[PDB]
Amino acid sequence: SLALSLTADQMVSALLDAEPPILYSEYDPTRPFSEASMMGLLTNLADRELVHMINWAKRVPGFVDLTLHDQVHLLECAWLEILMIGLVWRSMEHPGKLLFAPNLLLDRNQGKCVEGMVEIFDMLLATSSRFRMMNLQGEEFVCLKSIILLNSGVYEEKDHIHRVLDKITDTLIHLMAKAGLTLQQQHQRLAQLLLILSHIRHMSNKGMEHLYSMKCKNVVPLSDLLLEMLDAHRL
Amino acid sequence: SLALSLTADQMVSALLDAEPPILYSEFSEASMMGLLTNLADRELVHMINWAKRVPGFVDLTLHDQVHLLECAWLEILMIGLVWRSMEHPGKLLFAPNLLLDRNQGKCVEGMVEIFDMLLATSSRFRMMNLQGEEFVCLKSIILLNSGVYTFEEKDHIHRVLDKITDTLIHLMAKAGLTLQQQHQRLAQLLLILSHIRHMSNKGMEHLYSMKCKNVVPLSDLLLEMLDAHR
Amino acid sequence: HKILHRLLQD
Amino acid sequence: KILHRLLQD
Numbered sequence: 096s097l098a099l100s101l102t103a104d105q106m107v108s109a110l111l112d113a114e115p116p117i118l119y120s121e122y123d124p125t126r127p128f129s130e131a132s133m134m135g136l137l138t139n140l141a142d143r144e145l146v147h148m149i150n151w152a153k154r155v156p157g158f159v160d161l162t163l164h165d166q167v168h169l170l171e172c173a174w175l176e177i178l179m180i181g182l183v184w185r186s187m188e189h190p191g192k193l194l195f196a197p198n199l200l201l202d203r204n205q206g207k208c209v210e211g212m213v214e215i216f217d218m219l220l221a222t223s224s225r226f227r228m229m230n231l232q233g234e235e236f237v238c239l240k241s242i243i244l245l246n247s248g249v250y251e252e253k254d255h256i257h258r259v260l261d262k263i264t265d266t267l268i269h270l271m272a273k274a275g276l277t278l279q280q281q282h283q284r285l286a287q288l289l290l291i292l293s294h295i296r297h298m299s300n301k302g303m304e305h306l307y308s309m310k311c312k313n314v315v316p317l318s319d320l321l322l323e324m325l326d327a328h329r330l
Numbered sequence: 331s332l333a334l335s336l337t338a339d340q341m342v343s344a345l346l347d348a349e350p351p352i353l354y355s356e357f358s359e360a361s362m363m364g365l366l367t368n369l370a371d372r373e374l375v376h377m378i379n380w381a382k383r384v385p386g387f388v389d390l391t392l393h394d395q396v397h398l399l400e401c402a403w404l405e406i407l408m409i410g411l412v413w414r415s416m417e418h419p420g421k422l423l424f425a426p427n428l429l430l431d432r433n434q435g436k437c438v439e440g441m442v443e444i445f446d447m448l449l450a451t452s453s454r455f456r457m458m459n460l461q462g463e464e465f466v467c468l469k470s471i472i473l474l475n476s477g478v479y480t481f482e483e484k485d486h487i488h489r490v491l492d493k494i495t496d497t498l499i500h501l502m503a504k505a506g507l508t509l510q511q512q513h514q515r516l517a518q519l520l521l522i523l524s525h526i527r528h529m530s531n532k533g534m535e536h537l538y539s540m541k542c543k544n545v546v547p548l549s550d551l552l553l554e555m556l557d558a559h560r
Numbered sequence: 561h562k563i564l565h566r567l568l569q570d
Numbered sequence: 571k572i573l574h575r576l577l578q579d
């Protein structure tokens with residue numbers, strides 16, 4: 096239970112260290128955006144990020160203290176929320192665009208390539224603007240990503256998880272106190288950040304039913320990893 | 331706007347005062363679905379009356395109010411459900427004459443999964459000993475937050491939402507929680523709102539599958555509530 | 561028009 | 571379950 100001993104600064108340092116890299120898509124220009132090709136690009140990218148996610152999780156303090164079964168359940172619940180908050184974050188300096196990868200910068204117009212995708216792109220773009228408005232910092236972003244992981248399926252064992260969650264809240268508050276925010280302003284900012292998580296949950300649920308829909312339309316073959324995560328949100 | 335000048339005590343009073351009534355219910359998969367949707371449809375009319383009593387809401391343009399309501403309606407109904415189910419462990423008090431357990435959920439395809447979540451959430455408010463003043467704060471947060479991003483009108487909502495944060499903290503302080511306990515509890519409460527979003531989304535897609543299998547006839551308002559989501 | 565729109569203007 | 575195997579490694 097040694098994650099419960101870290102200072103606020105050790106926690107931030109630990110999460111910043113565990114950050115996965117930004118990956119490249121296999122976008123090929125000489126190949127107009129179809130529904131299949133873009134669905135192909137997005138899901139290929141998700142597949143590859145998934146392996147980096149699994150390993151990052153193992154490095155969120157307190158995550159390995161849970162049984163393999165709980166760990167599985169949390170990543171199954173959280174995986175698209177995590178990819179999405181990742182995307183939103185990367186997309187912050189690109190107003191009106193989603194930077195899925197350095198070589199895949201999309202705007203709301205090409206969400207249209209895929210039925211129902213545009214409503215999702217708009218939600219993602221709206222969350223990116225919010226981050227930008229609030230001037231979300233990297234240290235905050237990594238705390239939020241760890242909360243998504245531990246929160247989104249927290250169902251002793253889930254008291255340990257609630258101890259770890261409290262530790263991360265403490266860490267966000269520490270970060271804001273450090274930034275020179277008044278107590279009042281600290282509470283307000285903390286609530287603004289955690290209320291974003293509700294929108295990210297919404298987007299994940301929307302993306303998961305879109306994803307499931309795309310598989311029934313046979314738009315693209317999906318990874319065995321991806322098929323498993325998808326069948327976890329439906330049984 | 332006068333919403334922003336309310337003290338915390340006045341915010342809590344206005345909220346408690348605007349609370350909607352508890353309605354009564356009016357067993358096949360079809361009949362049970364009929365009950366649940368008939369209830370929701372009647373509650374919807376009262377929710378709308380409540381929304382208008384939420385400080386700040388009336389300040390929004392009618393189109394923003396519609397957007398917020400369309401986004402949040404089922405989240406609002408479910409948090410109410412989970413609140414009134416609190417002192418009924420293992421049961422969901424849809425109405426005082428409709429108190430259902432997980433066994434009654436198995437009657438409808440896909441519904442027990444939703445019941446089990448609503449039940450876990452109710453158990454969570456119970457372990458946390460969520461107080462009524464806290465509840466009304468959370469419910470109004472859902473109303474103002476759920477559709478907010480997908481919109482200086484936002485700015486106003488966010489000020490109003492900041493005011494609600496303050497009120498929540500004040501209640502915790504007054505209650506005697508430590509300053510650390512305050513931010514810890516605020517976070518725990520807000521995190522539960524993401525579980526409520528999750529549940530609304532599952533309930534929403536479930537309702538849509540009930541509609542498409544022709545299991546229950548839905549009112550014109552419910553059909554419209556559901557269209558906003560696809 | 562929308563029932564919701566309508567319910568709100570009462 | 572593929573995830574199960576990946577967490578193990």
Ligand SMILES: O=c1c(-c2ccc(O)cc2)coc2cc(O)cc(O)c12
Pocket residue numbers: 137138140141144178179181182195215302303305306307309
């Ligand atoms: O957004 C995504 C992503 C995705 C991939 C990588 C990221 O970094 C972020 C999102 C993957 O598959 C989908 C599949 C869908 O059907 C709809 C979606 O919105 C997505």
Ligand SMILES: O=c1c(-c2ccc(O)cc2)coc2cc(O)cc(O)c12
Pocket residue numbers: 366367369370373407408410411424444533534536537538540
């Ligand atoms: O939970 C509900 C409710 C419901 C009704 C009244 C309340 O106070 C709360 C939820 C209504 O319709 C549904 C319809 C569904 O398909 C699934 C559901 O879970 C529900």
